[PDB]
Amino acid sequence: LEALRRSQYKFPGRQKIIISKNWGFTPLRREEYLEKKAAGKLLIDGAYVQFLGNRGSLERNMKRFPDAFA
Amino acid sequence: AFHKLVKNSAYYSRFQTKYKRRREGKTDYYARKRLITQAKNKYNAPKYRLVVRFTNRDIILQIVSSEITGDKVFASAYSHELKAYGIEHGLTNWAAAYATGLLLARRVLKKLGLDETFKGVEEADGEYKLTEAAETDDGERRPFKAFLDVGLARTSTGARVFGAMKGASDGGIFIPHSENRFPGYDMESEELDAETLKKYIFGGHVAEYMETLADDDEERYKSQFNRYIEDDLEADGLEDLYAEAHAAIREDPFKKAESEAPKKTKEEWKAESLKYKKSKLTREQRAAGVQERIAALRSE
Amino acid sequence: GHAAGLRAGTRYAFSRNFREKGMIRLSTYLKQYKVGDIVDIKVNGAVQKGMAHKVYHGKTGVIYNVTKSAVGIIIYKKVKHRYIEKRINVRIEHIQPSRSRDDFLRRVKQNAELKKQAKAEGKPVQLKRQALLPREARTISVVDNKPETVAPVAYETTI
Amino acid sequence: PMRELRIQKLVLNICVGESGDRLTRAAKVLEQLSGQTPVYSKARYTVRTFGIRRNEKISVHVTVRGPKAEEILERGLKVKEYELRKRNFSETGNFGFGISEHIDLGIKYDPGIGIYGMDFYCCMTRPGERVSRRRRAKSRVGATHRITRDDTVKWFKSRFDAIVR
RNA sequence: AAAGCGAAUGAUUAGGGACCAUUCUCAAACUUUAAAUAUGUAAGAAGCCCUUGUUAC
RNA sequence: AGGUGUCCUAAGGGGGGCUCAUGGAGAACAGAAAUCUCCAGUAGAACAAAAGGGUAAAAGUCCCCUUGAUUUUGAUUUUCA
RNA sequence: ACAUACGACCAUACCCACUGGAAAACUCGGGAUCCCGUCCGCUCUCCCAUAGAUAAGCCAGUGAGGGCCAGACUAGUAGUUGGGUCGGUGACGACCAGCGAAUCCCUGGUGUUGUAUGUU
RNA sequence: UUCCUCGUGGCCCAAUGGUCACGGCGUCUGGCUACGAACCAGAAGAUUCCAGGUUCAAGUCCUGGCGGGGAAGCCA
Ligand SMILES: [Mg+2]
Ligand SMILES: [Mg+2]
Ligand SMILES: [Mg+2]
Ligand SMILES: [Mg+2]
Ligand SMILES: [Mg+2]
Ligand SMILES: [Mg+2]
Ligand SMILES: [Mg+2]
Ligand SMILES: [Mg+2]
Structure with missing residues (x-):
């Protein structure tokens, strides 16, 4: 918070500092992220994550998310 | 160094199919639009086409007129x-x-x-x-x-x-x-x-x-000509065979005559067709099969 | 302005939609037009012969002359302080019958049927269309669904 | 049933550097070998390093079908000592090779028509390929009816009694 | 106008798996979409239905 | 942000056959670029010349035949009084 | 209802892969004198309809397939017409009378139909 | 700032869109000389300033950038 407070002095106009309810850069609430992680609907792919959908090849989905079907 | 997929999904998304008869390779719409086009000052006067098609083992001749909702067959032979x-x-x-x-x-x-x-x-x-x-x-x-x-x-x-x-x-x-x-x-x-x-x-x-x-x-x-000699029709018998063939057409164009036993109606083979028709699965049928496939691969 | 030729500014008007360009459907050639019909001009860019100027694109007019593969259309063009009759020779490929006239023609035929039916039956009927009228008195039952009490929601969530 | 491999055609290609007497002589050797009039091929575009110009006749080739295509192929494999690299077989079922000193096929050598090399390329199909070449109702051959690399090499070994490595 | 770029064209950040699946941000001379306001025409007697007449089309 | 004062007996007219740019795989010299074969390939090519529309058994490309790039004056459109 | 010829809308019809197809038809098919056209009877053209086959074309079913089509959400949100001696230094914003979208995720579906001739 | 012009071997320069090209000096080798110059025989040497576009092909034709030069910058 102090880092962004110092930086906003370099910009014209008003800037606000807000705490995000989401987990990191993912657009999911902290409660939802825990639920998806427990269900195995997440695939750790680098700095970000990918989700499991009901559409697509069954083998590809089950191979990429083995825990979501056990 | 490595090529990319030409198709992917944008190719499918932006793909515009040709006309169904063009995809099936049966209609020349370039020539069709000129065969079928009446002068507008000839308001309702059909343009009749002599459709001549040569399938294997057959010849199809039709007199066809054109309409907005489809084509009409005036006569056939x-x-x-x-x-x-x-x-x-x-x-x-x-x-x-x-x-x-x-x-x-x-x-x-x-x-x-x-x-x-x-x-x-x-x-x-x-x-x-x-x-x-x-x-x-x-x-x-x-x-x-x-x-x-x-x-x-x-x-x-x-x-x-x-x-x-x-x-x-x-x-x-x-x-x-x-x-x-x-x-x-x-x-x-x-x-x-x-x-x-x-x-x-x-x-x-x-x-x-x-x-x-x-x-x-x-x-x-x-x-080549086993059927010709079997029915005892020599070379000199050809021009005469076509001679009365033309005359018989002139006298009677709607001669049914010859038939192959037995004669039949339309209904009872429609019942035969439905007996041989497969049917699509339902939502629960599709859902159940997916659950079975998941179980098989998980245990495998 | 600097450039004021035909087809100027018709980059989008005379183009064709995203996935319906290429071959032209043959139902356009099989439509039949009489003198007195009311048609809508819609220039098709796939055919560059016998177009109409961009001012007449999207306009509506009455057919007055029928020739082989094109028709003449009388269109009233607003020019400053007056209207001017404009006779446009446009191919049948750029036009289509107006459904508003067809909807009128089914109504005029229908009005004759009701008037004939009413006169034979022996009671008067109304032929004029009437605009929507104020609602009359009605009673609403709450035996199944009762009113739901809703109140404004708090700002609460910042995002 | 009707899934038997056949020699659909055999194309003999001779790509000489330039056009003139040398290319005309290459026509003679192709005509003598196949018995058919050959056709010259023009250059797509000019390139300086190769010494060719645009719309310039460069190569000459013929297409041979039938039993005469079969007998030319066996003569070419005789020069190759019935030996082919496994790389010579494309995955589409086609294959081919190249030879030098066209005299090795049995043609009588004559000064004036010197030493020429050839490329022998063979097209392999099945008795259903017309569905993709006919003018009316042209379509695509089914996936299970297509000739793979493994199928043509198996056919080549069991029929020509040659060795591939 | 808005919207879009895990859709074409163009611009553009980052990691990951072997080019592929993702990710951040854009377009007066880009776009699959697509408003509000404005805009063309019709709402009949010079009309509609039945029989029938004229013509060198 | 650009263009014109030109060019074409074909690059005009009619008809027929074919499919392009590109990518993958393969063949003596031959390789990143020569020519040949197959597969995929919605136009990502070409259409004299700026840019924008349009076009796939074509409007592109090759082949065959021609001169409607002719005669007669009218009606209509755009700039517009 | 199925097939064939000619169609209409022109992907719910397309692309990939797997499986199956009773009757007839479609098709692959056999030959190169004549008509005809090619470097090559490959294509086109002509003759055969006996032989063989559903291997392919074609049709049907399958795929938590790609796409396409429709709905829901996005959302009464973005945007916009008229109004005030409304707020704000301003950028802009709210309200009054109205209109009112489009993504991402989510779900469902995978051609309909006309003429004519036939089909077990 | 505006207009115009030029950029080529180590140096100075010329050039017909159709062969990466020319002339002189310079450099290299051999000969003559006791030796060096001069002289006589022969060789080698260019990312045509750079980045794009047209055409089958660009140093040549077109656009922009870099470096240099010339001309104009007036009435008050
Ligand atoms: Mg034709
Ligand atoms: Mg439009
Ligand atoms: Mg013209
Ligand atoms: Mg915008
Ligand atoms: Mg959008
Ligand atoms: Mg984009
Ligand atoms: Mg209106
Ligand atoms: Mg043509």
């Missing part, structure tokens, strides 16, 4: 219908096209009620002749006019397409016409050989091939 008139062999040769064209022309005039007005060339002599307006008490009456539609068939000299078109014109149907593509027409010297043309009309060209085969290769003659 099939080569397999010539069996009633005595034509058993060579149902898809050049002469069978002439007889089918003659059969269709007689059917059209009978449907129109003009059979006694236009008779065309009663005895075929292979002469370039146009169906002219008949002279009656009221004066001149213009003949029924139809246009040839070859489809995707090549329009080369001596093609069977012009055989049906020649047969229809001799029947009494006016067709815009030219002799450049008849057999015996010499491109270098623009004359039409009538003796060659009337030779083709009566199945002549088949006869010398049977004659040449008999002299040179008896075994090849046996294989």
Whole structure:
């Protein structure tokens, strides 16, 4: 918070500092992220994550998310 | 270093399919839009097309008119219908096209009620002749006019397409016409050989091939023309066979006569068709199969 | 302005939609037009012969002359302080019958049927269309669904 | 049933550097070998390093079908000592090779028509390929009817009694 | 106008698996979409239905 | 942000056959670029010349035949009084 | 109801892969004298309809397939017409009378139909 | 700032869109000389300033950038 407070002095106009309810850069609430992680609907792919959908090849989905079907 | 997928999903998303008959490769819409287009100051006057198609083992001739909601068949004539008139062999040769064209022309005039007005060339002599307006008490009456539609068939000299078109014109149907593509027409010297043309009309060209085969290769003659010799029809019996074939069409164009036992209705085979038809799965049927597949691969 | 030729500014008007360009459907050639019909001009860019100017694109007019593959249309063009009759020779490929006239023609035929039916039956009927009228008295039952009490929601969530 | 491999055609290609007497001589050797009139091939575009110009005749080739295509192929494999690299077989079922000193096929050598090399390329199909070449109702051959690399090499070994490595 | 770029064209950040699946941000002379306001025409007697007449179309 | 004062007996007219740019795989010299074969390939090519529309059994490309780039004056459109 | 010829709308019809197809038809098919056209009867053209086959074309079913089509959500949100001596230094914003979208995720479906001739 | 012009071997320069090209000096080798110059025989040497576009092909034709030079910058 102090880092962004110092930086906003370099910009014209008003800037606000807000705490995000989401987990990191993912657009999911902290409660939802825990639920998806427990269900195995997440695939750790680098700095970000990918989700499991009901559409697509069954083998590809089950191979990429083995825990979501056990 | 490594190529990319041409298709991926944007190719499918932006792909625009051709017309269904174009994808199936059956219609030439470039020629169709010109065959089917009536002058707007001819408000409701159909343009009749002579559809000539040559499938294997068959010839299909139709008089087709065009409508916004589809096409209408004015009359039809099939080569397999010539069996009633005595034509058993060579149902898809050049002469069978002439007889089918003659059969269709007689059917059209009978449907129109003009059979006694236009008779065309009663005895075929292979002469370039146009169906002219008949002279009656009221004066001149213009003949029924139809246009040839070859489809995707090549329009080369001596093609069977012009055989049906020649047969229809001799029947009494006016067709815009030219002799450049008849057999015996010499491109270098623009004359039409009538003796060659009337030779083709009566199945002549088949006869010398049977004659040449008999002299040179008896075994090849046996294989090609086994059905001819089995039914005892020699080379000289061809031109006579087509002689009364034309006459029988002139006298009766709607002769059913010959039939193959047994006769039948329409309903009970519709019941037969439904018995052989497979049915799509339902939502729960699809869902259950997915659950089974998951279980099998998880345990595997 | 600097450039004022035909087809100027018709980059989008005379184009064709995303996935319906290429071959032209043959139903356009099979439509039949009489003198007195009311048609809508919609220039098709796939055919560059016999177009109409961009001012007449999207306009409506009455057919006055029918020739082979094109028709004449009388269109009233607003020019400053007056209207001017404009006779446009446009191919049948750029036009289509107006459904508003067809909807009127089914109504005029229908009005004759009701008037004929009413006169034979023996009671008067109304032929003029009437605009929507104020609602009359009605009673609403709450035996199944009762009213739901809803109140404004708090700002609460910042995002 | 009707899944038997056949020699659909055999194309003999001779790509000489330039056009003139040398290319005309290459026509003679192709005509003598196959018995058919050959056709010259023009250059797509000019390139300086190769010494060719645009719309310039460069190569000459013929297409041979039938038993005469079979007998040319066996003569070419005789020069190759019935030996082919496994790389010579494309995955589409086609294969081919190249030879030098066209005299090795049995043609009588003559000064004036010197030493020429050839490329022999063979097209392999099945008795259903017309559905993709006919003018009316043209379509695509089914996936299970297509000839793979493994199928043509198996056919080549069991029929020509040659060795591939 | 808005919207879009895990859709074409163009611009553009980052990691990951072997080019592929993702990710951040854009377009007066880009776009699959797509408003509000404005905009053309029709709402009939010079009309509609039945029979029938004229013509060199 | 650009263009014109030109160019074409074909690059005009009609008809027929074919499919392009590109990518993958393969063949003596031959390689990143020569020519040949197959597969995929919605136009990502070409259409004299700026840019924008349009076009796939074509409007592109090759082949065959021609001169409607002719005669007669009218009606209509755009700039517009 | 199925097949064939000609169609209409022109992906719910397309692309990939797997499986199956009774009757007839479609098709692959056999031959190169004549008509005809090619470097090559590959294509086109002509003759055969006997032999063989559903291997392919074609049709049907399957795929938590790609796409396409429709709905829901996004959302009464973005945007916009008229109004005030409304707020704000301003950028802009709210309200009054109205209109009112489009993504991402989510779900469902995978051609309909006309003429004519036939089909066990 | 505006307009115009030029950029080529180590140096100074010329150039017909159709062969990466020319002339002189310079450099290299051999000969003559005791030796060096001069002289006589022969060789080698260019990312045509750079980045794009047209055409089958660009140093040549077109656009922009870099470096240099010339001309104009007036009435008050
Ligand atoms: Mg045609
Ligand atoms: Mg438009
Ligand atoms: Mg013109
Ligand atoms: Mg915007
Ligand atoms: Mg959008
Ligand atoms: Mg983008
Ligand atoms: Mg309105
Ligand atoms: Mg054409």
